[PDB]
Amino acid sequence: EVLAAANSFAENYSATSQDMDLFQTLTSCTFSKEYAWKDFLNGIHCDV
Amino acid sequence: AKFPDSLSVDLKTMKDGVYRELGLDISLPDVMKRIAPMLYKSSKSRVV
Secondary structure, three states: OHHHHHHHHHHOOOOOHHHHHHHHHHHOOOOOOOOOHHHHHHOOOOOO | OOOHHHHHHHHHHHHHHHHHHOOOOOOOHHHHHHHOOOOOOOOOOOOO
16 A cells, blocks of 8 residues: 555656755765765776 | 736746746746747748
C-alpha cells in the first residue's frame, strides 16, 4: 500500500520553486566541513 | 489592448504557468524583460 501510494503521489506531482529550493537545500553543502568523497572517488586512480 | 479588463488575469496566468513548467519566475525583471518573451506568436505572416 505504501508503494502504491508513492506511485500515485509521484505520477501526479508538480514541481514548485520552493520545493526546488528545499531540494537544493538538501543537495547543497553542509554546516560542517565535509570532504567531497564522491568526486574524490570518481577522480581517483589506483595502480598496482 | 483588445480586452483590457482581463489584462491583470492574463498577467497572473503568465506568472503562474511559466512557473509551473519551469522554475524561473517572471517577476524578476531579468527573465521577463527579454529572455522569456521570445515565446510569442509573430505577425509576419509568411506566404509560401
